[PDB]
Amino acid sequence: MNHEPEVKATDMEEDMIKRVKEIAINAVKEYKQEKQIAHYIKYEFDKIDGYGWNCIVGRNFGSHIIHQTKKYIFFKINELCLLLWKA
Amino acid sequence: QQYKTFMGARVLWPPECADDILEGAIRETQDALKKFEIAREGQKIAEHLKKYMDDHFDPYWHVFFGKNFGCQAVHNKNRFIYFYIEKTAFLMYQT
Amino acid sequence: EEIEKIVPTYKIGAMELMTHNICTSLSTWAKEWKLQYSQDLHKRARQLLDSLTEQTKMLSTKLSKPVKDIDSLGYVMETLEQIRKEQAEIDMKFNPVQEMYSLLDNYLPGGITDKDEMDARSLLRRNWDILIQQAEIKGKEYQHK
Amino acid sequence: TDKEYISEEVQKAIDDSVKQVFGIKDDSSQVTITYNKDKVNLWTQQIIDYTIRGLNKLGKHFKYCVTAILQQTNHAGISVQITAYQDTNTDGSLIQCYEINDIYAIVSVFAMAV
Amino acid sequence: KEFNNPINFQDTETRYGGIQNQVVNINQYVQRNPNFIDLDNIAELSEHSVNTERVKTGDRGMSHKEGGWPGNVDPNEAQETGRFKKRIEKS
Amino acid sequence: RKREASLITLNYIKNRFYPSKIQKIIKELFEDRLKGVEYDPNNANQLSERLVLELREKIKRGKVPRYKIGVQVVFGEIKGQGLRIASKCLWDVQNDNYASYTYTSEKVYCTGIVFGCYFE
Amino acid sequence: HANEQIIDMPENSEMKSMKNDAFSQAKFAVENYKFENKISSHIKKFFDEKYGPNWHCVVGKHFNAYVSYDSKNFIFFYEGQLAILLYRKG
Amino acid sequence: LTAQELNEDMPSKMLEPKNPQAPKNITVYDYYTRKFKTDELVDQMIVHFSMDGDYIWKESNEYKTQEEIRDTKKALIKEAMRKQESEEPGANHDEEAIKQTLRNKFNYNTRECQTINPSIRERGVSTEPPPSDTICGNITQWEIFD
Amino acid sequence: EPLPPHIIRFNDMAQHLLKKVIRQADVLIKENPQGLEKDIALNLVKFVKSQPEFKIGDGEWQCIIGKNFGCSLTFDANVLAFFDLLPSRKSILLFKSG
């Protein structure tokens, strides 16, 4: 079984964060590969939140990235860490 | 399951690992075992081999040889080497 | 475990020795030792929480300020950026403190500052979660400001 | 001569495969499928399977190596060259270059006796 | 008979692949303001189980309460013994 | 080892470690003959052929004899031009192999695929 | 009778669930399956389910082994006669 | 998918499309499934040189999208330029400065995020079974009775 | 001019720019070894931003450093530099997204 994620660092609207964890559970079951997961997230988020978008899916990594305000969200599912942002 | 004899060693014939990494690997164990014996000081020769793999090939090799054991492990594409020599069976896989 | 397993009496050809008599004394003295190392830790562990209770307080004060004046915004703007950096670094810095205070509990027959500190540790983690929520609300208030 | 290698037969096999993937033929560009980065990866796996299956059908006791080179809308000096260390009166190899609208594709076929 | 290579195997022929030169414009626009690339760092994994060949363990139960006879003669059977005694007394 | 002595009868094989040994041999040759990475005119196509002839002989030298060698070289200009060179050969599993190496310069790319098939 | 083990598991921050399930599974896995390979398939599959993937475990009566692991995920215990080894890496 | 008969009743073999160098299976842990998932079937197709390159043709589907992105960025710059030119008297702000002027501290925050990675560690474990001692016993009828 | 050991996965960037990033990246990991990936990421983005005639415009420089990560990003034409340093064995992703 796969329980719902937990948002560590986040800047999303009460409506949006639901749509992100939504797309997150759909993506993880559909695609096995770590790059294929990311590839789905972005292309779905290109329909809802305009052309420009980016997504990473790392078991162990770190960064600082420049993101549009209210268009950043980092959620860690059980032993996997997904970082997505805008522009 | 079908084994085969190449470079004086009894390996699983469908060579999971690439045939260069396998040849250099078996040859180093045979040249390690010509020095240190498995019966006496058997921990040392594993640690010698483990470090050798990290030098010449990609890092984080796991090394497992015994007269009797049974393992199911996840490894990278073409990074799994399992060969018998006399009676002792040598397993190792890159991560 | 050496004082656990220590033999209570050994013997030779024509003599018995009673070890318990000595052995019993060594338990209460090598305990005093671990009690010391646990009270070299206890003071270390408590100085981190204090640093982590303040740091979280120090950031909450900048939010508590009205910040009506121009020059005031420029001060507490750098602190929201500080909050973020903390948010990244702190989730790393936290993991040691959570285990440090645990490990202690198992090794100290003391019940750490009654319940006053247990409450202060649970309040800290709540105060951090409130701060993140407050920083999101402040971010919106900031855009209108 | 039941077995033996023939120039014409191989060429016919590759034509059928290139047609099977996206060639109604008939002397008019009835279709037009410009080269996507997504579709390229699929086409290669499709073409190569179809070519082999094509060679398989009429196949004798010849081993068959086939390489698929695609090219994004030419404009770039590419030159393919093939050499086979193999007895003459035994086997021959062939390459055939196709000019299919936007996509450009070269197919090679090695023949080896068994 | 079986499979041997005495026949010369040396000869080599080449062929020359190419494509036909076209127009410079090509009616295509170089690059995209943005570009979309999906970079993995992880290496595709595959699991293989290997177990050391356990030597086969037969189980057999034989009594030696009987004395040492020949093979052809049965120690239980009275006939087999009775004849073999009569064969010794024939010197 | 009667099954092993048997195994030699059905197929002699002579499985000379084909993959990386050749991959190392072709790599060493390519670097030297590429010379100027910048050079990709129309008069170097004829010179890119000469490379391919030399290549196949050094495959014979590198402990192959009994195998049957077929090599295909591709020399092309890159201008962010998206192309994929795949291959798939019908052969005897674990009885034959392939060797591939690709060298990418700033302005030029050269890929060398080498096919070897056992024959008796 | 498991005289000398090596326990390098987290223990602190209620991760004893991930050490105790090493001793607990081992006992249930060994008695039922009774095949060295199939043990290493059962214990691994469980520890992947609960604590996420990239666990490697190797079960043998007599073996040598040197290996790289993730600090505070490696435990080496004797279940009866048999000698089970499991650890994370990646 | 054919078979070679070998001369003088040798063991039959054959020749399969599948490339041997390619891995046998490929296993990629699912988080939804929550257990490792093996795929015996593989793509078993070798690629020497793969190259994905930015290069689009006039009137694609992918171009139209690229144009919309330019037109949105342009519109935001145009508005931001015009509004700064309308608010200020005879504004001499260059189009490059106006973009840098569009990216704010409260219109593009810049967060750092890493994951907690355990430090790698290399350990040795040698398992040697109990010593096995030879014993020699004889039993006779008298020694039993004695 | 020496260049430290590295493996290119994908380089959609000019050679002059890439070489200048790798040198810094090697020196920057060598400064704080067994140091956190975000600490190395932060200082690397500062360098590439700070250096003049390194800017290709559009987005803003943003660097991701890890040992294990897949991804899919939209970046500016000829501005993305992926590489993995052989002695460290840590991948480095650096690009501008508009």
Numbering used by the authors:
A (entry chain M): 1 to 87
B (entry chain J): 16 to 110
C (entry chain A): 1060 to 1204
D (entry chain N): 4 to 117
E (entry chain E): 12 to 101, 104
F (entry chain O): 13 to 132
G (entry chain K): 4 to 93
H (entry chain D): 61 to 206
The authors write:
Thousands of outer-arm dyneins (OADs) are arrayed in the axoneme to drive a rhythmic ciliary beat. The tail is permanently attached to the MTD A-tubule, while the head region of each HC contains a microtubule-binding domain (MTBD), which binds and releases the MTD B-tubule depending on the nucleotide states. We reconstituted the purified OADs onto MTDs to mimic native arrays and determined the structures, by cryo-EM, of free OAD and OAD arrays bound to MTDs (OAD-MTD) in two different microtubule-binding states.
In the absence of MTD, most free OADs are too flexible to support a stable interaction between OADs. Upon MTD binding, free OADs are induced to adopt a stable parallel conformation, primed for array formation.
